[model samples]
Each structure stands twice: as C-alpha cells, then as structure tokens.
Target: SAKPQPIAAANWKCNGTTASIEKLVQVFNEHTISHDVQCVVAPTFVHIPLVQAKLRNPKYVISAQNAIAKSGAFTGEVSMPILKDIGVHWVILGHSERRTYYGETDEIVAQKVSEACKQGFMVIACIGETLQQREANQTAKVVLSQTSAIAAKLTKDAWNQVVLAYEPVWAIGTGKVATPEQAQEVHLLLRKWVSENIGTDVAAKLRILYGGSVNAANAATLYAKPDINGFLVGGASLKPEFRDIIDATR
Candidate 1:
C-alpha cells in the first residue's frame, strides 16, 4: 500500500508519424490505467502538442525528449521555459544516446535537471553503465558518479520532481533486456546511494525505474522486484504491447 508511484514512460525516440501517433492515442485511450500508476509518453518534438491535445485520458502525460537548460539563442534546441509554455510538464534528460552521440556530460545533464526543476517541471533523469563498464566491474562507480553529479545541482525539494531511470546502454535498442536480478541489483544500489548521500526521506520516496529493451513479456517479473518502481520503455512503447507492459504493474 505504500509503494512509490509506479511510472511507465515511453520514449518514442524520433519514431512515429502523424498516422502512427494518432493510432497510438486511439489504442491507448481505449484501455484504463490504474489509478495507482502514472503513464507518460514522449513523441517527436513535432508531434508533442498534437498528442497532448488528443490524449483523452489524463493518465498519459507528455514528456519532451530533450530540452536545453535555459532559453537562449541556441537555435534548434528546445528550452525549458518554452516547453512549459507548450504544456509539457515532463522531460527525459541524460539519455544514453544524448550522452554518446551528442556528448552531453554529467555536468550538462545536471544543469538540465537543475533548470527543469527550477521551472517546476517533472524530470525523468537517466543513468547507466555500458557493457564494457559492467564487464570491467565499473558499473557502480559509473552510475553513482553520474547520479552524484546531478545531486550536487539539486535541492532536497527537487527530489519530488525527479524520477531516476537506469537504462544500460548495451541493452538499449539492441533487444537485450537485463535479467530481473541484474536490474534490481542496480536499483538497490541507487536507493542505498540516495539514502546515504542524499537523505533517508528522499531515498524512501524515490522512484527508481529500469529501462532499456523493456517489453510486455518481462515486465511482470521486473515489476515484482522491490526497487523497480516501473519502466522507461523504448522500442516497445510504440507497439500495442506497451499497454500490456503497463498492465503488468496495473
């Protein structure tokens, strides 16, 4: 009865056209999300407003895939203020793709989180190790340092606006899902890190989500773990089975 609010977030990740987005809205609205859970979706930037207006159920909120730390002359970058103006309350930041392809360092990611929280926006902040890091036994160091960097920029109050997602880069988009044991081990570490470094109150209230290659088939077992509050679904989010994944926790 005291579980942290479970969240199912979809990172559409540059996929979907008008037709597909409409179909997703139509299909998703037909089912009911449990009152106990939260669902959010991030469409391509061009499609967010349309999905926001068309979504019938309030359970599904809109999240932007990226946002610059502040509004400025950075052309081609969306800013936190403008995202709020458009009614998007959530942002997915520090995604591994952004870390690898765009060269967003932990410092940059923390800046974005601080900016988003300053604007009172909800944030889904991501952190995880690559396969090589795991093999090298550097997972804890990599993950905790990434998180610690972000924590430095955050106020204790900002914890309420944040959800930390752990998405192993090796598993993302490669169709390799972490075993439930592997996923929980990391989740447990994050909670302990939060408890020790942040505060026990903050740690107890944190929702640590597991991402990367999540699908309906494995969702139930993953959700059964003590630390996995929910998921940040990627490729599977565009499919009807996304609903099944949510149903696992619902």
Candidate 2:
C-alpha cells in the first residue's frame, strides 16, 4: 500500500430529529457515493439504527457520535454492548465538544477507546488542538497526547479498527477551515506519529480525516491534497450540499 485511501464522513452533530433525518436519508437514496470513497454518517444515537436500516446499501455506514465510557454508572449514555447489539460498528470518541463542553480529558478518552475495542466497536477518535494551543505552537503536541492516550490502550495491532479524526478546535462551526496545505501538514504529522509510535505499516495504513467547517465549497480543495485523505464533515452534512461535496471529492 502507498498513501492511505480516503474515507468521507458526515457528523450530523445534534442537528436533526427523526422526521428531518428521514428526509435526509430520502435524499441520500436518490444519489450514490463515489465508489472510491468510504462514506459514513454519524447521527445522534436515536437515528443511527433507523438510518442504518433504511439505507439498504452496504457502502453507506452508520456511526454513533459518542458512547458512554462505562456501562453501568452512566445514566444517560449509550453503552458499548448495546451498540454492538444494535449492529453499530463505529463510534466517534474524543470529539472537541466532549473535551470542551463536558471536560473530557485524554485519560478519559483513552478509557473510552479501550472500552470500544473491548466491545468490538470501531472508533473514529477525534483529536485536535484549540486556537490557543496552536498559537502556542503545540498543535502536534496536543494531537499526539490525545492519539497516544488512546493508542496506549491498544495492543499495537488494534489500529486496524480505528480512524483518527483531526478536528481543529476553532474551525468547528466557526466557518473557518484550515487551508489545504495546513490540513495536509497536520495529516502528515499524524501519519508520522503512527509510524514512529505504532508501526511503519500501521502508519501507512491508518486513515486520518479532516473535520471543522468542511463544506461543499472547500471539499474538493481539501480532498485534493496528497496527505489529506478524507473528511469528518459537520453542519453541511445535514443539507443537500453534502452530496455535492461527495461529488466534489469524487
């Protein structure tokens, strides 16, 4: 293998209800994703199984944005065993909102990764630095801590089921995306981190995706970069523009 293949994803991020989600899935039925692209849709917990059941295509995958770190203690969280029983194979962990709003730390994220893998769920682990951390020239440092925290829980070969997402903190919903070059630079660093810390093969094979204000207008530019493999799209994913972005990436 050479450069890791790309995967495009939509993080619906608390934006839609059952009726609205049904309409969105209806639009998706009318279009097809690029054959080369692996398309995933991360809806809120309530919509995941419903959307998965309606999609009918094997190419389109479903994701749960977050799951509980523990099984019994959490009162309002989705448990990993329940996710498995529902056929939910992938889950988003360590998103910026989880870290910023709920105060999730690197250690907590690592535990979540361990729990997911133990329950046989694939993880799309989100790691990114805040504007202040970037300004402090600690971008890679921040990402490494988050990534390495999760990696530490693995048995070195478990990365086969993990997709790392780099969602720059400020760019999320702020409408400012990292330039293509900037995105590529960070992706390269992510690959390098995997190589040095995981294994050369794992590094080459691991998929690191871009998130944060990624929409139809800029999809092609970011997708075109060599190191930038794919996206973990946000707001734009809810609208019809998502299919256009899919076309752009194709």
Candidate 3:
C-alpha cells in the first residue's frame, strides 16, 4: 500500500485579518506542493468564509481552530452545522492552549473528538505533555492518557478521519523546538501504544504529526522521522516561509 499522505497544517489561532488573509491566500496561490502532501490552514473562526472564497488552491484545505461537541445554546460557540455550512470541514480539537486556557478537560476533548468524528468532518485530534509533565517524566503517560480518552469515545472506523498532532506545550510559541530524535521518540511510543490498544491496521494507517516550533528551517529534520508524517504549525502559518514548510514534503 502507498504511504499515508503527508500534511503541512498551519494553525492561525487568535490571529489574522482581511488583508493578512488575502496575503496568505496569494502566497499559497503562488506556491507548488506535491500531491503526496496535504496542506491545511486553520484561520481564526471569523475568517473561514472569506478564506473559503479566496484561497483558490484546491490543495489548500481550510480548518477550524475549535468546534463544539454538538449544537446547543452555548453562546459564542461555533457549531458543526455552521462550520459545514461555510464549507469548512476540518476541525482541530484538544489543542494544548485550549486545555490550559479554556479548561477543556480530557472528557470534554474526547466528547468533541467523538462528536466531530460522528459528523462528516475530518478531525485533527491533538495530544501532548507540558514542560512540567515532561520534567516529571510523564510525557508518555500524559499523551497516552489523552489519546486513550479520545479513543474511548470513538468507533474503529472513525480513525479514518482523524490525524493525531503531538504538540509539546513547553515548545509551542516558546522558540524551543524538539530535536528530531525527541519528536520521533514520542511518535514511536505513541504508535506502539496504538498498535497494542487499537488495531495494528489502524496504527499503521494513522498519521501522526509533530507540532510546536516547526518552521521551514526545522521541518525537514522532523519530517525525516519514520512515524512523523506531518506538522500542525502555528506562527509561521502567516508568513512566506509556509511555502517552504510545504516544500519539505518534497
């Protein structure tokens, strides 16, 4: 069988504007990426409709930073129906920032993952450890527990629409990048866990992504890792270097 397609996903959380979005739209419009790679851009929620309109590259998929588990009276929350209505299908759940800032617990994250999977949307479900957690040697324990939470709520077939992103909270937006070895170590262990608990076929087919301080300069080294199939980028999503990040797939 062919390999799972590689991905370069940019998450523009709490950032972007009309003019800046246009710049990104143009930057990707002018770039070339391999068909073997998938390029995903997650703009702020407000900009999805505009992004859907101007981002002309069929290869560039639009993603949402967050999504509610289900439609409800939760004011100011974006619902699945609305996301689908705007033609945005990909949703990022269980982000580290969301966990720390918004107080979304493991149960809540799992609920959202299950809901997103039950729906028609593709999901990027994130799991990782913080600096303190890692210092205490809880990296594997933490990420595995988070993954187990999401796994508990999903049917086996739901894995087809899921891509797992591992973003160390210590490194995100902090200029600290995990060396390829460190990142691959986590990916390897995660895959091992999946193979044991989930089916071997599911583990083999799953795409695990490295996120956190992944810029064009460092993308290739991490991409070279056997279990690392892609990234979930942050700040660089708004810059010209995003094209080069996409180029790493080649």
Highest-scoring model, TM-score: 1
- Give per-residue CA lDDT, model 1, range 1-250, as digits (tens): 4678899999999899899899989989998876678899999899987897789977788999999977889988998888899888899999999999999999999999998999999999999999999999999999999999999999999999999999999999889999999999999999999999889999999999999889999999999999999999999999999999988885
lDDT of 3 by residue, 158-235 (tens): 999999999999889888999999999999999899889988999998999999999999998888888999899998
- Over 4 Å off in model 2, which ranges? none
Task: Score candidate 1 by TM-score against the native.
Answer: 0.98
For candidate 3, give the lDDT of residue 147.
94
| Order by lDDT, highest first | 1, 3, 2
Compute the lDDT of residue 163 as modeled in candidate 1: 98
**Residue ranges of candidate 1 with Cα displaced over 4 Å:** none
Q: What are the per-model numbers of colliding residue pairs?
A: 0, 0, 0
Candidate 3 residue-pair clash tally: 0
TM-score of 3: 0.97
Candidate number with the higher TM-score (1 or 3): 1
Candidate number achieving the greatest lDDT relative to the actual structure? 1
Instruction: State TM-scores per candidate.
Output: 0.98, 0.94, 0.97
